[PDB]
Amino acid sequence: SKENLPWVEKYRPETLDEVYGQNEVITTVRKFVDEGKLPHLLFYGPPGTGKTSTIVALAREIYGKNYSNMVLELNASDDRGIDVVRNQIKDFASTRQIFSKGFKLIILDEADAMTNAAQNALRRVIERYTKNTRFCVLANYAHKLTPALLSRCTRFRFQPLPQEAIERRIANVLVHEKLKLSPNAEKALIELSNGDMRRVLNVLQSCKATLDNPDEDEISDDVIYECCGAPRPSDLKAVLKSILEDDWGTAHYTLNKVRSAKGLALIDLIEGIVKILEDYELQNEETRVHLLTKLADIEYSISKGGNDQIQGSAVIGAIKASFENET
Amino acid sequence: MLEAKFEEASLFKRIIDGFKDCVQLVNFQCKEDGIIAQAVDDSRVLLVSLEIGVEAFQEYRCDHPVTLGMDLTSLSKILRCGNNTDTLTLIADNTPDSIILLFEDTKKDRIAEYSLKLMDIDADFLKIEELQYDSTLSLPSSEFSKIVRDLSQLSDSINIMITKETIKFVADGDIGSGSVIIKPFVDMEHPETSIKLEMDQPVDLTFGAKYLLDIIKGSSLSDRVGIRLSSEAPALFQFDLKSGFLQFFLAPKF
Amino acid sequence: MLEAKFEEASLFKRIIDGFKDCVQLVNFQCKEDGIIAQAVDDSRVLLVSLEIGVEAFQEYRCDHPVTLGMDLTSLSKILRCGNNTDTLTLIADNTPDSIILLFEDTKKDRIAEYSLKLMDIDADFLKIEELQYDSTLSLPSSEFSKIVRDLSQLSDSINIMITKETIKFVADGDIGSGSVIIKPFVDMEHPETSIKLEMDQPVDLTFGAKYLLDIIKGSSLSDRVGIRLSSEAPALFQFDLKSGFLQFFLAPKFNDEE
Amino acid sequence: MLEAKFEEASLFKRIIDGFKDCVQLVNFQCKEDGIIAQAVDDSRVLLVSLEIGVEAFQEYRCDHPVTLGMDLTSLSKILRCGNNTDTLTLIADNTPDSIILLFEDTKKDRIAEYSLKLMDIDADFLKIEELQYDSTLSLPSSEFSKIVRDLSQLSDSINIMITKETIKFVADGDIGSGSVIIKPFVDMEHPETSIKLEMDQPVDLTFGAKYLLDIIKGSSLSDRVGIRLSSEAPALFQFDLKSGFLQFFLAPKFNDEE
Amino acid sequence: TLSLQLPWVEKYRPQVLSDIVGNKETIDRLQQIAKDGNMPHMIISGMPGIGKTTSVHCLAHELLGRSYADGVLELNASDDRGIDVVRNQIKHFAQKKLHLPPGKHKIVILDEADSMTAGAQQALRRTMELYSNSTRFAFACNQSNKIIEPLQSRCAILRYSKLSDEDVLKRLLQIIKLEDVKYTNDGLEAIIFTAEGDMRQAINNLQSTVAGHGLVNADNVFKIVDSPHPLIVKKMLLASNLEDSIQILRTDLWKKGYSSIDIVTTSFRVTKNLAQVKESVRLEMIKEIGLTHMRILEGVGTYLQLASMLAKIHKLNNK
Amino acid sequence: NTWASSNKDSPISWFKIVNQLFRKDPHRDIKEQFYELLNQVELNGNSDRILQGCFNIFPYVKYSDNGIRKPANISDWLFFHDLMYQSMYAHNGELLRYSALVPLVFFQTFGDIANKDDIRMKNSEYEQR
Numbered sequence A: 001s002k003e004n005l006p007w008v009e010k011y012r013p014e015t016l017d018e019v020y021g022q023n024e025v026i027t028t029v030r031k032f033v034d035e036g037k038l039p040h041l042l043f044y045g046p047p048g049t050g051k052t053s054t055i056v057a058l059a060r061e062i063y064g065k066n067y068s069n070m071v072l073e074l075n076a077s078d079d080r081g082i083d084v085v086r087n088q089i090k091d092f093a094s095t096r097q098i099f100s101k102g103f104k105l106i107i108l109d110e111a112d113a114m115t116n117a118a119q120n121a122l123r124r125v126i127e128r129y130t131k132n133t134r135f136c137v138l139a140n141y142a143h144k145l146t147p148a149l150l151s152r153c154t155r156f157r158f159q160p161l162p163q164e165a166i167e168r169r170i171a172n173v174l175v176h177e178k179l180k181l182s183p184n185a186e187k188a189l190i191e192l193s194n195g196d197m198r199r200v201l202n203v204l205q206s207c208k209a210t211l212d213n214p215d216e217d218e219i220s221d222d223v224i225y226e227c228c229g230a231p232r233p234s235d236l237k238a239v240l241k242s243i244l245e246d247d248w249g250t251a252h253y254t255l256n257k258v259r260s261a262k263g264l265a266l267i268d269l270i271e272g273i274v275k276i277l278e279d280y281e282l283q284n285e286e287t288r289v290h291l292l293t294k295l296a297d298i299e300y301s302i303s304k305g306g307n308d309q310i311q312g313s314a315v316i317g318a319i320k321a322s323f324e325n326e327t
Numbered sequence B: 001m002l003e004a005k006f007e008e009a010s011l012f013k014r015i016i017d018g019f020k021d022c023v024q025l026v027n028f029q030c031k032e033d034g035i036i037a038q039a040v041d042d043s044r045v046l047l048v049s050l051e052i053g054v055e056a057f058q059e060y061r062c063d064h065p066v067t068l069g070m071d072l073t074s075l076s077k078i079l080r081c082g083n084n085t086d087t088l089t090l091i092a093d094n095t096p097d098s099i100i101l102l103f104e105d106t107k108k109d110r111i112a113e114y115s116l117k118l119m120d121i122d123a124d125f126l127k128i129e130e131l132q133y134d135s136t137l138s139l140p141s142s143e144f145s146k147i148v149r150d151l152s153q154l155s156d157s158i159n160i161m162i163t164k165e166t167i168k169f170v171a172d173g174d175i176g177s178g179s180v181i182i183k184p185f186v187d188m189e190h191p192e193t194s195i196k197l198e199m200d201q202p203v204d205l206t207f208g209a210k211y212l213l214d215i216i217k218g219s220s221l222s223d224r225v226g227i228r229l230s231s232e233a234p235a236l237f238q239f240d241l242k243s244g245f246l247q248f249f250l251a252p253k254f
Numbered sequence C, D: 001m002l003e004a005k006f007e008e009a010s011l012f013k014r015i016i017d018g019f020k021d022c023v024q025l026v027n028f029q030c031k032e033d034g035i036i037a038q039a040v041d042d043s044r045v046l047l048v049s050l051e052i053g054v055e056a057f058q059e060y061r062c063d064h065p066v067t068l069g070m071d072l073t074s075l076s077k078i079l080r081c082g083n084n085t086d087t088l089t090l091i092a093d094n095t096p097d098s099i100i101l102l103f104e105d106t107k108k109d110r111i112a113e114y115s116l117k118l119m120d121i122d123a124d125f126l127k128i129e130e131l132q133y134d135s136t137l138s139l140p141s142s143e144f145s146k147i148v149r150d151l152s153q154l155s156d157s158i159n160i161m162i163t164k165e166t167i168k169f170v171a172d173g174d175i176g177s178g179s180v181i182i183k184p185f186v187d188m189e190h191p192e193t194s195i196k197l198e199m200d201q202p203v204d205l206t207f208g209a210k211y212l213l214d215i216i217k218g219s220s221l222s223d224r225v226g227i228r229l230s231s232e233a234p235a236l237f238q239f240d241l242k243s244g245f246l247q248f249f250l251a252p253k254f255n256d257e258e
Numbered sequence E: 001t002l003s004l005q006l007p008w009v010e011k012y013r014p015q016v017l018s019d020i021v022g023n024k025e026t027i028d029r030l031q032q033i034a035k036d037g038n039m040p041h042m043i044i045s046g047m048p049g050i051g052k053t054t055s056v057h058c059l060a061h062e063l064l065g066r067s068y069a070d071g072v073l074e075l076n077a078s079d080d081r082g083i084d085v086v087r088n089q090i091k092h093f094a095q096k097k098l099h100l101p102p103g104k105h106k107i108v109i110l111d112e113a114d115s116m117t118a119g120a121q122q123a124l125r126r127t128m129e130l131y132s133n134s135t136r137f138a139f140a141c142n143q144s145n146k147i148i149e150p151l152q153s154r155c156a157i158l159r160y161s162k163l164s165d166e167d168v169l170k171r172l173l174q175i176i177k178l179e180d181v182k183y184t185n186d187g188l189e190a191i192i193f194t195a196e197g198d199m200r201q202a203i204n205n206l207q208s209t210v211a212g213h214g215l216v217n218a219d220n221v222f223k224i225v226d227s228p229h230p231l232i233v234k235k236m237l238l239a240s241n242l243e244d245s246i247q248i249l250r251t252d253l254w255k256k257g258y259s260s261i262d263i264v265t266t267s268f269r270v271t272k273n274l275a276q277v278k279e280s281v282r283l284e285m286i287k288e289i290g291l292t293h294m295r296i297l298e299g300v301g302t303y304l305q306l307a308s309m310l311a312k313i314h315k316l317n318n319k
Numbered sequence F: 001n002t003w004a005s006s007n008k009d010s011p012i013s014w015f016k017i018v019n020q021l022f023r024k025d026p027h028r029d030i031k032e033q034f035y036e037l038l039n040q041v042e043l044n045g046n047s048d049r050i051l052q053g054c055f056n057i058f059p060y061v062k063y064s065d066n067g068i069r070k071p072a073n074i075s076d077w078l079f080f081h082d083l084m085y086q087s088m089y090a091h092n093g094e095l096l097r098y099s100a101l102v103p104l105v106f107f108q109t110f111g112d113i114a115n116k117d118d119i120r121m122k123n124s125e126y127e128q129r
């Protein structure tokens, strides 16, 4: 049953009308398929944008419910070498369908992990067998693909999910589940997503589990922040104010009590302070240079461990010394 | 439930030898009229299809069909305990997580029992067999194996061409070309060596030698092989069993 | 000195086949009552112990014991010249630097002679055999080989469990589990196929399948295999020879110990 | 043109088995008195030379000699279709780009026909055979194979030494040394097992074991093997056919020369 | 839907050497060679999508006439091209007997010659040397340095260059005339700008824009194909003030879904190929970019690292 | 004197590139020389051997010396190269593009018009290893 799959897998789009966020590419692909001219596609974009769902729904709309048989889907989980290409992909492209009549579809998902020799062998397979089969390459990084292979396909960039589409999907999930969500809670949820539907679905399931109730109540900002462990804008701005204006010992005490009262992480506070200070209209860019350099150094040091108190004091001192040049 | 006892474990071992290597996953289904099994290779050019009727067993009981999928390699790994003469019983409940293979010698003596883990495969049996094929022919399977083994050395493609009263296998590659031409004939001195051919339309198809090589394994199950060809569908190579058959459907080249 | 002539080079070749692969160094010692040999694998979980009495030879002369160590691989490399039917004579002086293997055909015709370099090994023969084992059983060795070959595919550990009138071999791993259950029985139609069992105490030990696989080789030396198990010591698998025996002592896995 | 029909495809298959592995390119030439073929290995220490007279065939027609070169590997790849009992006909025009091998069963039934691509090789047949050799000997080829297979294990060099009424093969390497000594003898109970030796001068030559191993393959063509040795030239190992022979000329090692 | 139509790159693939709008010198050279015959061994190198494979295909077709099927041996990177293939199949084709006109020769086309192993390339030397009177070799590669010097010594070297604006514009105008498409000057200009001398990519973008919107206009071309990525990165690095570069990185690159790895790597390329600033400042900017590249490869790839990289580059440019 | 066919199909011996990295031509733009040298270092694919060559040669090269700081700046690059080379065995070789930049720092820092003679070199490191 579908009630056992996680929310990321349960709510996977099955038709092209359930893929939100991407409109300019979805309409163009629908027109390509209706008019017949479907070229070799290259879906490039960040994780969680809906490239795999888009191509799966496309193959479903093209071949019907028997998609799992008329399409050759290869990914990084499967062995994709040069010999694998030579045998499997060439035998698939050269032959025809065993279930119906029509062009074939080869979905090379996550093809950014393929060997250079494999791409060099495939770039002539795409150019030779082009009247009976098509190629779809999904990628997160366009630098791992050879320029020859990159030039044979039409590139579609999957933009991050905007506010309207992610709110539409959230409303769809809140309709499918016996769940209510606060408006400010929804805004905070959209803020900690960066256009990643996977994160939204995961944390929505997690905060529904956090409710502890038969779901007769609502999900507020407190639930989201306590479940995702993300700092609140209130505590963020309080720490920033105490760092910018208050005394050194008082700033240290404030940072300690804020990061220990809710168990917040220093890296999340660093990213939040970076995001907040990005809107600050500042004087001569030397302060911004020092701030960015020191904050990136502290983040790279945190990414390897160390003393949290020493790193917090380093953040405080870096912000203070950077702002001391603004006078 | 599944409860099928083979008189000789050898029959099942040879049947599985046929799926061996060319496919990884097999989907079995037992029911009131017997057992069927289907396996498709990754490139989807070969389908291996089995049918064993109730009469092929020494004991068969089924009051509730069971479908079960498994890794072919795991199965063959376990399929060398039959002593060939051992008795083999396939056993499974109505909602199995495993398949039990039970080998026993006549006397109570030695009992080898296995519990193979199953894989979940979306049930989707194909029914691609045709009513009529362009041409139909049968010949000794050992002869077909030799024909395939000859030509294979020359190319990765072996062409089968059929015209009135003529069957011609051809391979042409780097070192040169080869051909084997056979003609229909009835041998009364023993008709299991005859070569029959019924042609409704001349055919000319090419197959990947690597696949024909997988298919010839069926020789171990039957003296003769039936080959049905069509320009409209995958070719059918069939090896008859006592109450049953092992079929290989192979898609022609371009 | 060493002077031992085997009627058929084949017997010695099969004996060495038993040490083969599972051990690298073998320490032989000839004496007045015959020849013995011991080899222990690197992990020290397997001991291969041989005894060939004077009567197993066509000619044996010993007025002064000689101990000699050698590389098993070197020995087997040379042990395929026996034609099986050739006569084999092992020869060595009292303070040898080498061991001479002399293969001769009945007629004077062809004489293949080898001079194998010896290794110096500290003489330290083990005497780990027990007076009484918890349980003792014998069965056809080809049957034991099949039992081991079956289960081996399933796991790196094969458990042997003994209860009154019941012997059960079990393996359980990734693909699933398997078991072979045998029962004691006397076959008068030919008792070399019988399965005997004497149990003083139920036993349940686990062994590393890789080692049992090395041990089954003894089938080529005897129709039956004797298995003696104890919770106090290494298990003993024994293959009798005419005047002699080849023994394999295998330490049970502690939980992870071959 | 070339038109040679072998009664049994098996004869040709065994002949080619002899060139197999040790040489890559073979130069055939058919003519009025039969077919000859020569192949030299890359290091030029071994020459394989064949002669098949007209009488070895069931049908042979030649009104115009044809020389043709080919890759040995390609030929053997195709040389397993003979069913051994099949009939084999070699066919080629006077200026061929290919060689046709035609295998047919007695009945019209099955006809396997091959068209092998030829290689252009500068015609340069060698005629290195000597009038007289220092020593000449023949013995069963299976015996010669065993002698070679024994010694090969010990060294990459096998020495052949001949003195009055004595033939001695010797190998000496890392693990030790070995020798096989044979003596001339006439067995009337069946003279195909006799060992003849005619010595005009004692000889002592060393050959690379890898090459002698290639040569022993001829056992499948003849019961006996003739070995002719000289200190002035390559040794000749010969396997007679009904109307023909397969010869292997092997250069002695200088000290290091196969 | 039941079947698709052939793309314009394959449908309008040139079949005669006159239809090629590539480098005029080499095109007329190959045309005169096909007219007179005696085609020598050749190696055509260049960049993807400029008319290298089509050029050699047209040359072989025009030179062999109807004997193209039995006189041309095509081997791509999709087929095995190891030592065994060169030893057996290529040698059998070169030794094959074939009656040809007294001005033609058998052609062995080897696509993607830069991917052949060293053993095969070494074996091909005598293979092409002993049969240079009845078999000719034409290699098509992107990097001539990947082919060994002994092989390059036995053949001519044809280096194909980028296609200027005029040639691609003329080819696109010919395609539009042959297809009756509604277009505009700014749309074709945007297409050529996003093509970057890539004729295949230009025709592909044109066909995609036609099948997606019908009218080839700059707005449609820009909405269906993003601007040349390297150009926005160059404008970001060449910014004079820190806030402008930060806003560019935020809006154009980060808010549109461009991964940090692509941004930093595109950044490295732009710098390496930069010519506006001096050598030392370019090396310092490359050093800072490469330190950011290091941090990113370790999984610390975020917007803060790129912001710090830009800040360090500006500090270097801050005298 | 045979070298025409070499100029026609063969690259620049890594030794010749090392000697070119220490040479400045007074008659050509420094930027054009830098891009020509970058292309030669990239085409060779053996940036490590070129750098090891530069490391063995730089103490024997004539370079206007103020306090031998130039060597101190180059120790930091060389350390950057060693970190990059260690990371090539841990990570997919995207970092290989930056390996050609480290040899070019020698051209910027130690390239002089005085360096007209070719310094021959050896492999002390293989012997030391």
Ligand SMILES: Nc1ncnc2c1ncn2[C@@H]1O[C@H](COP(=O)(O)OP(=O)(O)OP(O)(O)=S)[C@@H](O)[C@H]1O
Residues within 6 Å of the ligand: A007, A008, A009, A011, A012, A013, A018, A019, A020, A021, A022, A046, A047, A048, A049, A050, A051, A052, A053, A054, A139, A140, A161, A169, A197, A198, A201
């Ligand atoms: N545009 C979208 N509309 C609706 N749900 C979406 C959308 N994008 C992602 N999702 C959800 O996120 C899940 C994962 O989507 P995927 O297509 O697998 O992500 P992706 O774009 O392929 O990125 P990868 O797989 O990490 S490279 C889907 O099953 C949906 O539940």
Ligand SMILES: Nc1ncnc2c1ncn2[C@@H]1O[C@H](COP(=O)(O)OP(=O)(O)OP(O)(O)=S)[C@@H](O)[C@H]1O
Residues within 6 Å of the ligand: A148, E008, E009, E010, E012, E013, E014, E019, E020, E021, E022, E047, E048, E049, E050, E051, E052, E053, E054, E055, E141, E142, E171, E199, E200, E203
């Ligand atoms: N000069 C040209 N004139 C017309 N069309 C061209 C030209 N160059 C390329 N094309 C088009 O681009 C398609 C592919 O060209 P190719 O020759 O395969 O590219 P390439 O130059 O070989 O680069 P590769 O194959 O990626 S190494 C052709 O089928 C044409 O449609």
Ligand SMILES: [Mg+2]
Residues within 6 Å of the ligand: A051, A052, A109, A110, A138
């Ligand atoms: Mg995906």
Ligand SMILES: [Mg+2]
Residues within 6 Å of the ligand: E052, E053, E054, E111
């Ligand atoms: Mg190309």
